[PDB]
């Protein structure tokens, strides 16, 4: 879908017909791909209805194109659709770590304990895999393969059908050799729609291993149906997490994702391909960020960010500052570097003493001037300008392309501003 929503935004940005029919048309193509992807039709409707509400309440910030503000709002929502902006903790801090893998049959389960193991080996952790998925006979000889293929030890007991026993003898052995990350691959006798019974079954492999983390592995081809199992699973424990696999093998990726997230779950990983290293951290906002163009969502995390560090910081000063301006200037620059931004960039000051209504200092071009310094400074210098003398002014100068006097002007303005903010009270 994301790749499809990418062509639906290109046709909305390129100002064809009016606005009002464009959004409609847009909305008519969002709703149609999402459903297509098997997302609950109750999620699809609260989205395109949450998108229009905001489009009626949140006019675009000056300098923003109407057609750019809408899209802007869309991603946001799409994000929230998939669990919104959150960056799961993937590097444990309680060594060693027991991660029990659980889920219905074939869910990219067995390759996931590979990738997973892999992922953690790459982060230089001593991992030990535990094959305890006895219902598929081929699941062991498969895990032993990957392990030897990624240099990770694998502990299994062929033919044996006692999972618990296996998981116990495995983990005990890997905590002995003093491993660091121990991943136990288990399975499940039931499928989707037999939730209760499935989870109940996991119970007796949980108590035995008393794992620090449990990971439900879902096949992205279950679409929104992964829902039931999800909700129930996330509740059943305070240490539950999920992985979404095979997203590149089903047009149902959105259903699984939109469904699971609906549960509030923590989708820590998401399987992308069939190669070992293909397992990415999962952070909705980024996952979606993968559609269209970085600088299309850019003014976004740049505006909100840029504006907060702005308004606030001025406040905090009124009640050693000089590094601030970077933030302020880096901010404006995020929103186009030409005047089309300065006009509504009334400046950092905020407003104070000044003749009549004409301002006091700067110029529109005085822009790649603020910048001047900044780079012409190390942090020590941006926190206590007073340590900026001769030698340093020259380095500063040359490093920006200006002449000593320029840094002097800059520094005298700064001081004039800091003297003001202070004065304020």
Residues 416, 425: Cα–Cα separation, whole Å: 15
CA distances from 71 to 8, 28, 349 (A): 10, 14, 32
The response to whether 266 counts as a known ligand-binding position is: no
Q: Is 401 annotated as a binding residue?
A: no
Give the CATH architecture of domain 320-425: Orthogonal Bundle (1.10)
Under 8 Å between Cβ of 89 and 212? no
The residue behind tokens 């618990």 is 164
Residue 106 annotated as part of some ligand binding site:
yes
Residue 315 neighbours by CB distance under 10 Å: 11
The answer to whether 188 is annotated as binding is yes
- Classify residue 27 by burial, with Cβ atoms within 10 Å: 0-12, 13-18, 19+: buried
Exposed / middle / buried, residue 99 (Cβ in 10 Å: 0-12, 13-18, 19+): buried
Ligand-binding site membership of 108 (annotated): yes
Sign of CA dihedral 172, 177, 182, 186: negative
Query: Which CATH code fits 96-280?
Result: 3.40.50.300
CA 222, 226, 231 angle in degrees (round to 5)? Answer: 175
The pair of three-digit structure tokens given for residue 317, joined into one six-digit string: 């000063």
Distance of CA 294 to the CA centre of its chain: 13
Instruction: Enter the resolution in angstroms.
Output: 4.0
How would you write 228-243 as a 3-class SS string?
HHHHHHHHCCCCEEEE
Does the annotation list 399 as a binding residue?
no
Query: Determination technique for this PDB entry?
Result: X-ray
Q: How many CA atoms lie within 13 A of 181 on its CB side?
A: 24
Fold of 1-88: 1.20.120
Give CA 272 to chain center in angstroms: 16
380 known ligand binder: no
189 is in an annotated binding site: yes
Sign of CA dihedral 329, 331, 333, 335: negative
d(CA 64, CA 125): 47
Cα–Cα distance, 154 to 146 (Å, whole number): 9
263 carries a ligand binding annotation: no
| Distance between CA atoms of residues 194 and 237, nearest Å | 18
Question: Rg for the chain (alpha carbons), in Å?
Answer: 28
- Is 248 annotated among the ligand-binding residues? yes
Helices then strands, each counted (H, E), the chain? 20, 8
Q: For residue 107, say whether it is annotated as part of any ligand binding site.
A: yes
186 annotated as belonging to a binding site for a ligand? yes
Residue 105 annotated in ligand binding = yes
* 422 appears as a binding residue in the annotation: no
Q: Where are the domains of the chain?
A: 1-88, 96-280, 320-425
Measured CA to CA in angstroms, residue 61 lies from 294, 296, 335, 337 at distances of 19, 15, 11, 16
Q: Does 247 belong to an annotated binding site?
A: yes
Using alpha carbons only, give the angle 265, 268, 269 rounded to the nearest 5 degrees. 125
Among 168, 170, 118, which residue's Cα sits nearest to residue 140? Answer: 170
**In 14-162, alpha helices (H):** 19-36, 41-47, 50-57, 66-81, 112-122, 138-149
Q: Which residue has the tokens 């951290």?
A: 281
CB count, 10 Å around CB of 146?
Answer: 19
Kind and range of the H or E run holding 260: helix 253-262
The residues with which 299 forms a beta bridge, in sequence order, are none
Select from 83, 5, 76 the least CA-distant residue to 37: 5
């Amino acid at each position: 879908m994301l790749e499809n929503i990418r062509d639906a935004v290109r046709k909305f940005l390129t100002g064809s017909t009016p606005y009002e029919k464009a959004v409609d048309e847009f909305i008519k193509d969002l709703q149609k791909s999402l459903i297509s992807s098997d997302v609950n039709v109750k999620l699809v409707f609260s989205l395109t209805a949450k998108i229009k509400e905001r489009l009626n309440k949140e006019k675009p910030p000056s300098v923003l194109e109407r057609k750019e503000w809408f899209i802007s709002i869309v991603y946001d929502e799409l994000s929230k659709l998939f669990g919104g902006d959150k960056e799961p903790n993937v590097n444990p801090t309680k060594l060693p770590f027991i991660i029990m893998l659980v889920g219905v049959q074939g869910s990219g389960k067995t390759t996931t304990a590979g990738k997973l193991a892999y992922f953690y080996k790459k982060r230089g952790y001593k991992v030990g895999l535990v094959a305890a998925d006895v219902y598929r006979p081929a699941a062991y000889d498969q895990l032993l393969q990957l392990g030897n293929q990624i240099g990770v030890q694998v502990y299994g007991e062929p033919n044996n059908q006692n999972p618990i026993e296996i998981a116990k003898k495995g983990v005990d052995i890997f905590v002995k050799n003093k491993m660091d990350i121990i991943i136990v691959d288990t399975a499940g006798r039931h499928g989707y729609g037999e939730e209760t019974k499935l989870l109940e079954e996991m119970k007796e492999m949980y108590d035995v291993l008393k794992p620090d983390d449990v990971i439900l592995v879902i096949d992205a081809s279950i679409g929104q149906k992964a829902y039931d199992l999800a909700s129930r699973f996330h509740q059943a424990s305070p240490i539950g997490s999920v992985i979404i696999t095979k997203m590149d093998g089903t047009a149902k990726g959105g259903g699984a994702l939109s469904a699971v997230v609906a549960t509030g779950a923590t989708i820590k990983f998401i399987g992308t391909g069939e190669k070992i290293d293909e397992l990415e951290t999962f952070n909705a906002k980024r996952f979606v960020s993968r559609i269209l163009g970085m600088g299309d969502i850019e003014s976004i995390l740049e505006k909100v960010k840029g504006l907060e560090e702005y308004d606030k910081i001025q406040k905090k000063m009124e009640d050693l500052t000089l590094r601030d301006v970077y933030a302020q200037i880096i901010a404006l620059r995020k929103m186009g570097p030409l005047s089309k931004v300065l006009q509504h960039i009334p400046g950092l000051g905020i407003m104070l003493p000044t003749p009549s209504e004409d301002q006091l200092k700067i110029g529109e071009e005085k822009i790649r001037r603020w910048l001047a310094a900044l780079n012409s400074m190390t942090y020590k210098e941006l926190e206590n300008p007073n340590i900026i003398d001769k030698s340093r002014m020259r380095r500063i100068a040359e490093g920006s392309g200006l002449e000593v006097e320029e840094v002097r002007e800059l520094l005298e303005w700064y001081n004039n501003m800091n003297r003001l903010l202070k004065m304020v009270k």
